Design a protein around this ligand. Structure first.
Ligand SMILES: CCC[C@@H](CC(=O)C(=O)O)C(=O)O
Ligand SMILES: CCC[C@@H](CC(=O)C(=O)O)C(=O)O
Ligand SMILES: [Zn+2]
Ligand SMILES: [Zn+2]
Lengths: 18, 338, 338, 18
């Protein structure tokens, strides 16, 4: 569980959220 | 280098020349330029390595796009237009500026109609001003009829199969990018897969693999410039960033009709060629495949990057203040792991 | 210093003198010595600060214990006896030695019967050997009848109320400690609350609060010497451990009938006085209270220590190898947070 | 949840487990 928590990717890109 | 400038058909001569490229401190080798039917191209994509595909027809209906066509047809929605007094358009997240009130951005975002962007561009060119603009806007429902038809005419058959074969998640957005000659997007990595579809003009793309994290010094995760390199490529500070002396890039120049696969977590520096006129690009951002069921050791570089990001996020949350992350990390390592 | 040596009743003179204390590089101030009925004593315990209680009668029935009485009555169970050719009995976890195969312990554990410990002690004293022994054994069901009765006669009324008032968890064990004069337990912290009940002879206790983590340089969590200081107090390496120049201790000498509260996470260095004969101690280890329901910011030092330990544990697990923890931490901080 | 995970104390002491 801890391992999969730490491996989880985000999805952030260079586009400003409103 | 990028590879010899491609000679354009009809004997129209070199599309560009090396004098249009900015000068940097590090060596590069070329990204392969291949047909989409070339099995080596599929091998690179499968292995999450960059490739330029020359013949996808991914945005074929957009290759006729210019400012006049877009102004007439793209509708009356708002477009984000960045303004800067430098060639560098360093990305920052406005929502993180509260965390770092001493951060003073060198670019500013203005919302305007497309015809106002065209007019402002013409004002600048007329007065010989030094102001620079970079329009960066996700395509949405407000676009006019002809743009909808052009968009529907993209090669969805080809890119849908890529998404399916690679196990990727959803297409999250298409960013329309219209830049002035000489504009630079400084080195950063994104957490999505990207097919980067060049439409007008030429962009020099310099990529660095995820295992060069140590050489490119991203900002802290909670800083507005999360995922961007702290190194000033025009004046690298080797005392603060000594392993930037070890960086090695993968380079290409894309022109109309080319598609660059920029794999998730790969660093990329993008510049619109000097004296090359305006550039137009549309990207295709896809969520990456999920974490695999079984983890294989030792981990890949991008997995360690994912871990490091999560450690920084969790510490910022647990300590109640993102400014306490650095002091805690230093306390952990000094005289213990360094 | 520790405070003036206490004068023993019946005009028996100073129990000990300062020539029996080892010489170290750092200053100290005294731990308060108070009656258990003194409201200041309760205030210190409530605030998780050390105090010496002089009149608890916590181990009153054990104050008659010596090697002859214990040998006759403690039974025929096995006792862990550490042997070393140095005065320092640095703790290490045998179960972590696989992680660090270049770690060569300076003390070794031997299981023996109590009469074999007494005999070995006498062999050493007879030949004037330099070998040192330290018996360190949790009390259990194998002890003989008279030891059971002595144990039942401890002041459970007093210490049960402490456990209840502080919200502590269970008593996990009582460690019987029998050391030779000059034996040293190097600086470490424990993750349990401790009432340290001195029975025979004198021990100099030097404590450091949890906010001196930065000055005491614990080993990596996965190293056999987890929770112990890397600093050699007899020859401090200020190039590797520069903030040891800033450490400040809380010092006392406990003798028969004294009880030192060693709060959870407090560093402590313990030495049996030079030329003072054998020492006997029994400790009382209790699990700490649970994490509170609501977290208050900014966090306490012991909370940040708990976080740091967990980060090291999680990274060791996620990276699949505890040796990759340091390189990842350095990659995270260098040129980013340092 | 993450905060309470990171704040959780262990119970290790200087006594060798068998
Ligand atoms: C806002 C990104 C602009 C970049 C492209 C890029 O980094 C990407 O598509 O991820 C450029 O100047 O073309
Ligand atoms: C094995 C610990 C021995 C120490 C006591 C100590 O650190 C503790 O009780 O936690 C000593 O030499 O008396
Ligand atoms: Zn990008
Ligand atoms: Zn201890």
């Amino acid at each position: 569980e801890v391992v999969k928590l730490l491996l989880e990717a985000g999805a952030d890109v260079n586009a400003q959220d409103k | 280098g990028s590879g010899e400038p491609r000679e354009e058909a009809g004997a129209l001569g070199p599309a560009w020349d090396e004098s249009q490229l900015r000068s940097y401190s590090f060596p590069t080798r070329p990204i392969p330029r291949l047909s989409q039917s070339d099995p080596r191209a599929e091998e690179l994509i499968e292995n999450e390595e960059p490739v330029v595909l020359t013949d996808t027809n991914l945005v074929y209906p957009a290759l006729k796009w210019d400012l006049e066509y877009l102004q007439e047809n793209i509708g009356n929605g708002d477009f984000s237009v960045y303004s800067a007094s430098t060639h560098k358009f360093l990305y920052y997240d406005e929502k993180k500026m509260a965390n770092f009130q001493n951060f003073k951005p060198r670019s500013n975002r203005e919302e305007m109609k497309f015809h106002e962007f065209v007019e402002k561009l013409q004002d600048i060119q007329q007065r010989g001003g030094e102001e620079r603009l970079y329009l960066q806007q996700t395509l949405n429902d407000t676009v006019g009829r002809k743009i909808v038809m052009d968009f529907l005419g993209f090669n969805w058959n080809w890119i849908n199969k890529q998404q399916g074969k690679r196990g990727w998640g959803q297409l999250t957005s298409n960013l329309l990018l219209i830049g002035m000659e000489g504009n630079v997007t400084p080195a950063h990595y994104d957490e999505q897969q990207n097919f980067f579809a060049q439409i007008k003009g030429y962009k020099r793309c310099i990529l660095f693999p995820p295992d060069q994290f140590e050489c490119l010094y991203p900002y802290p995760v909670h800083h507005p410039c999360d995922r961007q390199s702290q190194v000033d490529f025009d004046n690298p500070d080797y005392e603060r960033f000594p392993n930037f002396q070890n960086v090695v890039g993968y380079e290409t120049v894309v022109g109309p009709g080319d598609v660059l696969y920029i794999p998730m977590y790969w660093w990329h520096h993008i510049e619109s060629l000097l004296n090359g006129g305006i550039t137009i690009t549309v990207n295709f951002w896809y969520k990456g495949a999920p974490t695999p069921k079984r983890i294989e050791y030792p981990l890949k570089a991008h997995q360690k990057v994912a871990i490091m990001r999560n450690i920084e996020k969790m510490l910022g949350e647990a300590l109640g203040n993102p400014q306490e992350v650095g002091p805690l990390l230093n306390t952990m390592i000094k005289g213990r792991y360094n």
